[PDB]
Design a protein around this ligand. Structure first.
Ligand SMILES: [Mn+2]
Ligand SMILES: [Mn+2]
Ligand SMILES: [Mn+2]
Ligand SMILES: [Mn+2]
Lengths: 211, 211, 211, 211
């Protein structure tokens, strides 16, 4: 018996227009319905090829399919964090509080310095990718990392707490080439409650999904 | 107030010659004292630059330093797993048992198919890198991934259970260009108890470290 | 005495709206005035850092600056080919003639199959990048390659004859996520005379950039 | 009619032990007979898959195959330049003369400054790769570039004049982890005559191969 677990597109936690004016309904719709859906589809396509190989039903270029899986699986995972990382202005935006504020102050000095560091990491991704805030479980610290594509430069075992997508399709329709203004405006929709919930799990030595 | 947590070289769980003749005493000594040491130093060097930056003390090429951090931090994590992943012949090397055996059977059909898929993965790494078995927490399944260098193609949030280093320095002194037979002999030193300990943590929703 | 030669943005060979309706004037303006200009600026910035190093005037993270140079210099070179690779419909579009048609038939069987393979390569670039047709001088043959970002997967010494940009900024404002329709519409503006001129140089074992 | 031109392994210009004590006989033999042969084999295997698709004979993962082709073709091209780039001690490996010396002085200030930049580039390659010196035809200057694997970070259209392999298999049997002393010692075998012939070709606007 051989099984693979398949992936599905999660619904947004809010309406397509809920993050306006900071991210347009048009972007939200395309980004979720087309781009995120495509990564779910691609991940499942790679799994089907692997399962067929595991069954002894077909051959496989192992490198090619695992490269494909890594790309799409990561697109799916990062977007799945990205949506609840944001919230309509009110629930979204402003400064953090609770444990996340304290830990940000601890490792980065202040929220202002963290904001600068995270923004600069996002603005300076070469090509397409992400800025992420992770909890590194080995020495138990917050780190900012750049991710290229969806799958390059992750820290093994690390838990993603906050993710900012700087693929051109995350902003181009509204901001055009001005990724900087997009990054700066995105702070207005950060759902700190979600980031806090992720950090709480991470601090307890747990995987920070499925809140 | 700014802090960063620094990394340290862990001792091997055994002697340098404990994995002989499957992997050389010379390789063990160089691999750990020189190669793994380098990654610790590299990670700490990156942290210093970030810490200095966070204090508004110096400037930074944030892309460069985060690239450096990603490479070296991953070097340090993967090797930190790699050593206890192995055990002296007898204690190490056999067929899996418990939950790891059953889940391997569930997703791959048999241990034989898994062993084939994992070996194909390790032998077909383009350039230097790793073959890894992860627990993927989103749909809760085992996956094999190829890693290039130390930091390319990880699955975000996923827990590393088993890792094989196929960087040339992991084998060349003993096996020369013959990576295939190095991968083949490595099975004889696999510590299935360690992998089981990591899988149980992952199943618990915990980080597969510290145990 | 230390010198570096600096790069400059070439003017377009036609008006911004000359490729309508296949590529909008809005895209052409941003793509040239912002995106291409940025690569020129980035390549010159990396050179100034290298020049300061060569003067013994400043220290340098050599890996970082050389990665930066490679990215930007390639962005500049590929865009510099991209623009004259296209022409207003009439001069642009249709099927190739002369030596290019013959060599396409020799290596690909027909212009139909070539166009199929080139379009598929473009559509299937993972993340951002290019499809290119090159002359490979060592064994003297046409090859299609996928380029990721601007600088990943080029053939050393090979001459670029035809280049198609599939970075999202090349099409997103007009075609949104539908890269496939962008790729298909682009054939209508291909400047075959320019491709022929490049092939003519490459066939004599010449560098095929400046004619 | 569909054709692909296939590749072949070139003989070394000298005996395996001809570069001792700087690069060992054992290394020269494995490096050429095993590693370089593998790249020739891989390039032809990829071309066979492409040829089969062009005839409409089989389906293809165009991204996978073109990735494979890029890696192995570049392996083959760079190793082909690598061997004649070197010569037995004395018989070639001191300081450059003629045009190569003049342009090195022009762009790097002096040979000593060039040597430092080239050495530093090679020593600071992350993972496996190359340091190369290229003639960049757009602004007609010399540049040093780092290459990762065989195919990452080349400059489109540029002509490779000098290549230094820093893949681990290029030095590990003799130098172990000490890549630095290998890079330092390689200068004793550089064939500046070969480099000069490549430069003159690039200056003529020719591809820097076949002589
Ligand atoms: Mn996205
Ligand atoms: Mn290692
Ligand atoms: Mn572009
Ligand atoms: Mn080599």
């Amino acid at each position: 018996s051989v099984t693979t677990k398949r992936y599905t597109l999660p619904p947004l936690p809010y309406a397509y227009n809920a993050l306006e004016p900071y991210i347009s309904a048009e972007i939200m719709q395309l980004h979720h319905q087309k781009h995120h859906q495509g990564y779910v589809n691609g991940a499942n396509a790679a799994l089907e090829k692997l399962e067929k190989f595991r069954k002894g039903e077909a051959q496989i270029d192992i490198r090619a399919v695992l490269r494909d899986l890594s790309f799409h699986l990561n697109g799916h995972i990062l977007h799945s964090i990205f949506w609840p990382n944001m919230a309509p202005p009110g629930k979204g935006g402003g400064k953090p509080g609770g444990k996340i504020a304290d830990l940000i102050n601890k490792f980065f000095g202040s929220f202002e310095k963290f904001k600068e560091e995270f923004s600069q990491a996002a603005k300076n991704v070469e090509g397409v990718g992400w800025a992420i805030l992770v909890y590194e479980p080995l020495e138990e610290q917050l780190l900012i990392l750049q991710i290229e594509k969806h799958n390059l430069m992750h820290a093994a075992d690390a838990q993603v707490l906050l993710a900012l997508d700087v693929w051109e399709h995350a902003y181009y329709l509204q901001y055009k080439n001005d990724r900087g203004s997009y990054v700066d405006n995105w702070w207005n929709v950060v759902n700190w409650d979600d980031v806090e919930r992720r950090l709480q799990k991470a601090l307890n030595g747990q995987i920070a999904l499925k809140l």
